[PDB]
Design a protein around this ligand. Structure first.
Ligand SMILES: Nc1ncnc2c1ncn2[C@@H]1O[C@H](COP(=O)(O)OP(=O)(O)O)[C@@H](O)[C@H]1O
Ligand SMILES: Nc1ncnc2c1ncn2[C@@H]1O[C@H](COP(=O)(O)OP(=O)(O)O)[C@@H](O)[C@H]1O
Ligand SMILES: [Mg+2]
Lengths: 367, 365
């Protein structure tokens, strides 16, 4: 009966060193909810509406959306629903050097969404930690690189090459998953921060022409929260459990080989990123046409990313998209591709449900 | 016209099998003998007339020492005083607790002492100085189809086990030629002779324990009840003789699990043959009591031969089987339980033990 719509949001980034050296023009203007793109040639103007818009272009102009603002507007509802008993997903999308990693992870003195999410989660837990409710939290953090899966939260052994790949499998009920994945327990913010540091140090980064710290890999942060609660029953208590999966996803960029001066491994990994975005795009185009009566088959098996995220793009999750765009005029068509895929993702509808861990057993038939 | 009163008696976990987490295989649901294979390959069911669930105290029906005596042995005493013969067989494997079930310990005593004390008490109560009761006793063993007396001390030799032979008196029935009969008046007089005889009984260290019986044991009480004559003349004219028999058989002992070594293979065969004959006799008597014409094979074993008159006519026969509830002794418990069933066994399987969430059907119905 529920049909949860996907929460699309947009973030305009300020000018970069490259776009200031080449004195590129501003074309992405905002008025609040709406985002418009006045082409330089002045032959046509496009405009798009979204649930949420962020304008980090100027640190002084009114309407400046900060890390705390994007958090409190996007992630806090997802935290409320995750405590309610829903699965949640927040995934970034955009081009190279557009503010996806800065938006989600952030830097040391400019945190992104992930640390704030974990911090507020643990705060609400410590503030609701009664004997009525117990809380158990597991985390995983993994990487997709040249269609191979990798665990980020391990201390690699010394060798000429030490990256042990994992395999993806399909459980008939739970859906796709990764076999051999470290699921580490967490009690408070400190362990989370240490694991995040280890993961962001093990992640794949390189220096390319459009970002010196360009992530060469998709990154997924999974939190499994199990909250146990009681009901006065014929015997002992502690007989309700609610599980929730929170998937925070930072993806890479399209990376045109001409601008991004690339030869060898960068081309190779870059090409892999291009094949991962093409598949993802095709899955967001088929999910936006399957929510309009037309019947379509979503291709999730053509990429490990979309295969693992089968349950988030569709299926059972409350999901949100952060499109990242640059205001320069030298990237208009790529910004527009991002905005068109975001406006199509707006039309996605999922079926989110409470994970009472009791269906078909006894209280399903009570109900 | 009397069928056997077969009864079973499960024992509780001991120290070793409670420490080593040996799981329970024998359970109770009113039939009180259901065996769930630990792999749940088969669920057997062993309906019995009487059964004593001495597994854990908190269950209703914890059959204690007093319970088993007052239930199964005291009728044999009330019947002995009626002028009729009785036999009580004890069957169990090494470790089931047959000794603690029949004899008992200094605490929580057993069938033998309860029977003897109640006998002496009822005698002293019914005694009038016009009626009198006299008790003599004998104690022998059957070994490799041969007879031996247990109350005869032996001298200096390798060993002095002399064989006696059985003979049929045309009226008194079968008996042993050369058996020692000894008078008694109190339970110490019996306990002394028993602690003497169980030292000369046959025992050897086989594949099971070093103290495992390899011979059947018969303990016989002969009771003479004499009443006087009021018409005129001699007393000793109204005499009633009763025979109580307390037997202790050995184990079936399969050779597959115990590579018999020449002399441990001559005793297992004999025991296996005697148990088969005993089973045929009991099944034929049960079928007789339910209105059939059959023939009881007394003659295929010295045991049944000498116990003919105690296993036929107006006599009372009981058999108490002792079993363990551990999964370590499943092959032995099923053996003990199959040799005791005078009915049809019921084997089945269905994994309803764990319906996923508290009897799905109660609300899915
Ligand atoms: N809102 C912002 N304020 C200040 N600097 C920003 C902002 N957004 C992005 N940047 C800068 O731009 C770069 C973003 O690179 P990154 O987001 O990692 O690329 P990608 O999104 O392709 O992974 C960083 O060096 C960061 O300092
Ligand atoms: N029904 C019972 N209840 C409690 N304890 C028992 C029971 N049967 C046996 N036991 C304990 O286990 C032992 C009995 O085993 P035992 O008589 O040595 O076996 P067997 O007589 O077959 O050689 C005794 O030590 C006794 O304390
Ligand atoms: Mg990045």
């Amino acid at each position: 009966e529920f049909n949860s719509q996907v929460t699309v949001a947009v973030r305009v980034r300020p000018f970069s060193k490259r776009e200031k050296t080449e004195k590129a023009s501003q074309v992405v203007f905002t008025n609040g909810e709406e985002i418009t793109v006045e082409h330089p040639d002045m032959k046509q103007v496009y405009s798009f509406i979204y649930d949420v818009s962020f304008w980090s272009f100027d640190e002084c102009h009114p309407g400046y959306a900060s890390q705390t603002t994007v958090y409190e507007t996007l992630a806090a509802p997802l935290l409320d629903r995750a405590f309610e008993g829903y699965n949640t997903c927040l995934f970034a999308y955009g081009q190279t050097g557009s503010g996806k990693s800065y938006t989600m992870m952030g830097l040391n003195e400019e945190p992104g969404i992930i640390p704030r999410f974990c911090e507020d989660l643990f705060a609400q837990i410590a503030k609701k930690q009664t004997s009525e409710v117990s809380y158990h939290l597991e985390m995983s953090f993994f990487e997709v690189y040249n269609e191979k899966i990798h665990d980020l939260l391990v201390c690699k052994g010394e060798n000429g090459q030490r990256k042990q790949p994992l395999r993806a499998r399909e459980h008939p009920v739970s859906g796709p998953y990764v076999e051999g994945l470290s699921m580490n327990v967490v009690s408070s913010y400190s362990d989370i921060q240490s694991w995040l540091e280890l993961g962001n140090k093990q992640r794949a980064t390189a220096a390319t022409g459009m970002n010196d710290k360009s992530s060469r890999s998709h990154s997924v942060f999974t939190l499994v929260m199990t909250q146990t609660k009681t009901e006065v029953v014929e015997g002992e208590e502690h007989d309700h459990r609610i599980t929730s999966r929170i998937n925070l996803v930072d993806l890479a960029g399209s990376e045109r080989c001409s601008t991004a001066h690339s030869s060898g491994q960068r081309l190779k990994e870059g090409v892999s990123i291009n094949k991962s975005l093409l598949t993802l795009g095709k899955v967001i185009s088929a999910l936006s046409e399957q929510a309009n009566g037309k019947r379509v088959f979503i291709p999730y098996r053509e990429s490990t990313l979309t295969w693992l995220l089968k349950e988030s793009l569709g299926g059972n999750s409350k999901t949100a998209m952060i499109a990242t765009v640059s205001p320069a005029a030298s990237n208009i068509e790529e910004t527009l591709s991002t905005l068109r895929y975001a406006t199509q993702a707006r039309l996605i509808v999922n079926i989110a449900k409470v994970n009472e861990d009791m269906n078909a057993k006894l209280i399903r038939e009570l109900k």
